[PDB]
């Protein structure tokens, strides 16, 4: 058994890891998940008698470990700048005009700005080693055990690389509704943003695990050191490794299409399973970014369109 335990937990780990990618990430259901579940129940039982084989990125970790009675501060690897806000066609034009004066027409990448909790996740050789909140931007809290419960985040990546990436953790609308009712059956959350930040900022891994959190990876700290030369190449790269990258992202040749994208989400937004706050726009090329630089506050190559005032 102890020699065979390892063998089978290792198979177990591989298969479960594989299969969680197709449910949680590609969304090839997560419905009749039987064998998945059968397979998870066997790993859990093997770790029950051989607690020493429960690997830090074993699928078991999504269940969640024991509470912590404290969280540690973490500064740990590259500042997390915040973005300038835009509120109308026009802040948008003005944001492009300083783009053009300095670099000529520049292609943009437009993304949906998710209303959630910003986090950083770090990996070493493919392994998830640490998770943290945005904090003030230079320091945040180690929320690693609660991040392991977000089933779409990978504990082990497709290739053994060492990197740090940034994503937004959120809770889907219907999950938020579900949630609150039971809270009413017994208190009550304001909205998903505070539900997710709430779920991630409490000390008990298992209550995180029960809130059905999700996350969308949106950037790569130090992408230049890894050889990436474009914002669109960063995400793609991130997608090739196994991360969940929001698929409504689109490359925009100029401000006009930028605004066409911005109008398209403004009214297609109610139909989303998650709550979007606006639209983040970035100059795609890392070279135009260098040229525009920053005001060590806010990149001149990025703006955050904040949607309106219902």
């Amino acid at each position: 058994d102890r020699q065979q335990a390892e063998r089978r937990a290792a198979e177990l780990r591989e298969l479960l890891n594989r299969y969680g990618y197709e449910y949680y990430v590609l969304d090839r259901p997560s419905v009749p998940d039987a064998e998945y579940d059968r397979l998870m129940q066997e790993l859990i039982a093997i770790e029950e008698q051989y607690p020493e084989l429960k690997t830090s990125d074993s699928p078991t970790q999504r269940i969640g470990g024991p509470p912590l009675e404290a969280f540690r501060k973490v500064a740990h690897r590259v500042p997390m700048m915040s973005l300038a806000n835009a509120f109308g066609e026009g802040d948008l034009r003005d944001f492009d005009r300083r783009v053009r004066q300095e670099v000529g027409e520049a292609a943009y990448v437009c993304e949906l700005a998710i209303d959630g909790l910003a986090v950083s996740v770090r990996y070493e050789d493919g392994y998830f080693v640490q998770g943290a909140t945005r904090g003030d931007g230079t320091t945040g809290e180690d929320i690693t055990e609660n991040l392991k419960t977000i089933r779409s985040l990978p504990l082990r990546l497709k290739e053994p690389v060492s990197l740090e990436a940034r994503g937004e953790a959120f809770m889907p609308k219907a999950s938020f509704l579900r949630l609150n009712e039971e809270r009413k059956a017994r208190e009550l959350f304001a909205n998903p943003r505070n539900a997710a930040a709430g779920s991630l900022r409490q000390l008990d891994p298992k209550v995180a695990a029960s809130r059905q959190l999700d996350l969308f990876v949106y950037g790569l700290a130090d992408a230049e050191a890894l050889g990436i030369a474009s914002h669109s190449e960063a995400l793609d790269y991130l997608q090739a490794l196994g991360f969940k990258v929001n698929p409504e992202r689109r490359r925009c040749a100029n401000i006009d299409e930028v605004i066409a994208f911005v109008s398209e989400w403004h009214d297609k937004r109610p139909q989303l399973p998650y709550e979007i706050d606006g639209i983040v726009i970035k100059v795609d090329s890392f070279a135009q970014q260098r040229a525009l630089g920053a005001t060590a506050k806010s990149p001149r190559w990025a703006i955050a369109y904040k949607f309106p005032a219902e």
Side-chain angles (χ1 to χ4, degrees):
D1 206 57
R2 183 143 198 297
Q3 298 180 15
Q4 164 53 278
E6 301 210 53
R7 179 144 266 210
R8 158 111 290 225
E11 302 186 296
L12 258 24
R13 283 197 302 282
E14 127 193 1
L15 286 160
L16 290 161
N17 273 343
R18 215 140 84 191
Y19 305 131
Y21 181 70
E22 314 141 322
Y23 309 116
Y24 300 112
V25 188
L26 305 179
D27 292 325
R28 305 223 216 91
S30 38
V31 295
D33 225 4
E35 272 264 290
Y36 180 85
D37 292 298
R38 189 206 308 326
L39 294 174
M40 178 83 75
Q41 294 147 178
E42 306 174 17
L43 247 179
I44 289 168
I46 304 224
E47 297 154 12
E48 260 161 3
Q49 93 164 305
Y50 296 120
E52 48 260 21
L53 298 152
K54 166 177 186 151
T55 285
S56 287
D57 308 293
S58 149
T60 281
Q61 308 259 8
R62 325 288 201 160
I63 255 126
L68 326 175
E69 37 24 87
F71 294 121
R72 44 166 291 92
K73 290 319 193 319
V74 26
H76 233 352
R77 289 176 110 197
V78 175
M80 285 171 81
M81 289 175 312
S82 211
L83 300 183
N85 304 289
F87 306 99
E89 139 153 34
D91 295 88
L92 244 29
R93 296 204 120 128
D94 310 28
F95 149 91
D96 197 337
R97 203 197 40 194
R98 40 104 72 107
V99 173
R100 304 201 278 84
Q101 303 173 341
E102 273 145 81
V103 303
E105 263 148 48
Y108 296 112
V109 174
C110 276
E111 311 171 72
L112 312 172
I114 282 141
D115 230 313
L117 177 78
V119 283
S120 61
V121 277
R122 163 202 191 179
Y123 289 85
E124 281 195 25
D125 305 340
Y127 292 93
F128 177 38
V129 279
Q130 172 158 57
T133 43
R134 189 158 89 88
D136 53 21
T138 95
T139 169
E141 289 170 344
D142 185 319
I143 72 191
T144 141
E145 304 324 301
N146 306 334
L147 281 173
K148 314 218 229 147
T149 69
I150 294 197
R151 278 137 338 145
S152 66
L153 187 56
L155 300 191
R156 162 93 159 198
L157 237 42
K158 299 207 161 147
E159 297 299 346
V161 64
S162 293
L163 55 68
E164 188 182 305
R166 330 290 207 184
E168 194 75 359
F170 65 104
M171 165 189 301
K173 289 210 193 162
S175 207
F176 170 60
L177 286 182
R178 214 101 73 169
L179 183 63
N180 259 354
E181 274 138 48
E182 340 156 318
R183 316 253 326 152
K184 169 269 145 183
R186 293 225 86 203
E187 19 190 9
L188 232 81
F189 302 85
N191 67 276
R193 198 267 140 195
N194 305 351
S199 304
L200 292 149
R201 271 203 276 89
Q202 63 57 243
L203 295 164
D204 193 356
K206 312 189 162 68
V207 349
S210 80
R211 305 250 257 253
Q212 307 182 267
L213 292 181
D214 203 341
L215 183 155
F216 269 143
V217 186
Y218 65 74
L220 185 43
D222 252 317
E224 321 223 10
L226 285 175
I228 313 291
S230 177
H231 186 33
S232 25
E233 167 194 36
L235 309 171
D236 283 356
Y237 175 81
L238 275 167
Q239 173 187 87
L241 282 168
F243 280 117
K244 248 215 195 163
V245 168
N246 184 132
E248 300 317 329
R249 98 204 183 268
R250 223 100 322 174
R251 275 151 70 209
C252 274
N254 62 237
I255 200 56
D256 282 7
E257 321 177 326
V258 157
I259 290 158
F261 195 88
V262 161
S263 139
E264 155 177 6
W265 285 100
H266 171 282
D267 70 25
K268 230 197 212 231
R269 115 169 141 139
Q271 324 166 3
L272 258 353
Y274 44 85
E275 256 167 13
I276 77 179
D277 202 19
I279 302 288
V280 177
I281 297 124
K282 304 181 142 155
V283 164
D284 198 345
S285 161
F286 290 170
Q288 312 169 132
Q289 288 180 23
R290 263 319 166 60
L292 285 151
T295 65
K297 269 293 304 318
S298 301
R300 309 175 171 70
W301 53 263
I303 195 127
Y305 178 91
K306 298 291 219 224
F307 274 134
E310 95 209 51

